[PDB]
Ligand binder design. Structure first.
Ligand SMILES: COc1cnc(COc2ccc(F)c(F)c2)cc1-c1cc2c([nH]1)CCNC2=O
Length: 283
């Protein structure tokens, strides 16, 4: 593997572009200085392997002063594509995205884990034949939510300090409640509305401590009724967020219902099933 330039930073470590030298294929290479977390993330990926929209790990090991995890190269993140599309996606694109994202999250849940860091940066489009598939990345904050053998849900816990990115965190996460399935989905809800509006009402709030800033975000989040947040947009978005906040800590979300909400809306809007995203029209 030839090592390349730094293209990003995950919940842990830094990712670089690279090359499978003998196959002449470009790859993504995540490095962790040899508190270790890379191997754990690698195990989760392997456990998720074989699912739709999940990256393939090509190699895992240590070289020098680094633990290394080579992954198949993917396309731009949804945050990147959002930028390229002038930071506003058309309703059809949000719906096409929502259908796949609910599904990715549902799959991770079917495998007994919660992601805990659902945000535009952690969703990347594929390449080649899978150019229209939305992948989910970075399991650096993922956690098991039910025992593999018995499916006993983890217990309810309070006073937890925040983990994930504040902009898309659920109201309960801000309130120190252990995250569960409902939270990955509520976060997706804010992500969708972010795509619709171009920004969220609790963005760009200035504070001192960089811990007092989460407080402002929390208060704003609890001070902004859902109907206001989604005012001027299809009621489905508000219905989706309300459903998410109504989920009991250990409830199994009805993913099908949520997708159907957006599918019916798609049908009613009269959009064509050609799967053409906004970025597919850049010339
Ligand atoms: C399977 O994981 C990946 C596969 N392919 C790419 C290609 O990314 C680029 C290609 C060309 C560019 F010019 C560029 F800027 C980025 C990136 C990743 C990736 C993994 C992680 C991140 N990114 C940021 C957050 N934490 C992560 O664990």
């Amino acid at each position: 593997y030839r090592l390349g330039r730094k293209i990003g930073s995950g919940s842990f470590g830094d990712i670089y572009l690279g090359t499978d030298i003998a196959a002449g294929e470009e790859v993504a290479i995540k490095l962790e200085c040899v508190h270790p977390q890379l191997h754990i993330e690698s195990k989760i990926y392997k456990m998720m392997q074989g699912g739709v929209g999940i990256p393939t790990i090509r190699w895992c090991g240590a070289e020098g002063d680094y633990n290394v995890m080579v992954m198949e190269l993917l396309g731009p993140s949804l945050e990147d594509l959002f930028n390229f599309c002038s930071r506003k996606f058309s309703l059809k694109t949000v719906l096409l995205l929502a259908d796949q994202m609910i599904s990715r999250i549902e799959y991770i849940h079917s495998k007994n884990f919660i992601h805990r860091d659902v945000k535009p940066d952690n969703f990347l489009m594929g390449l080649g034949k899978k150019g229209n598939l939305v992948y989910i990345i970075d399991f650096g904050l993922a956690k098991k939510y039910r025992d593999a053998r018995t499916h006993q849900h983890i217990p309810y816990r309070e006073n937890k300090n925040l983990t994930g990115t504040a902009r898309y965190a659920s109201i309960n996460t801000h309130l120190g409640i252990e995250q569960s399935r409902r939270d990955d989905l509520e976060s997706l809800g804010y992500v969708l509305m972010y795509f619709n509006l171009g920004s969220l009402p609790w963005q760009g709030l200035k504070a001192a401590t960089k811990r007092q800033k989460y407080e402002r975000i929390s208060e704003k989040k609890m001070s902004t009724p859902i109907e206001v947040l989604c005012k001027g947009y299809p009621s489905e978005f508000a219905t989706y967020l309300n459903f998410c906040r109504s989920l009991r800590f250990d409830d199994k979300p009805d993913y099908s219902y949520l997708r159907q909400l957006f599918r019916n809306l798609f049908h009613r809007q009269g959009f064509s099933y050609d799967y053409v995203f906004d970025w597919n029209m850049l010339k």
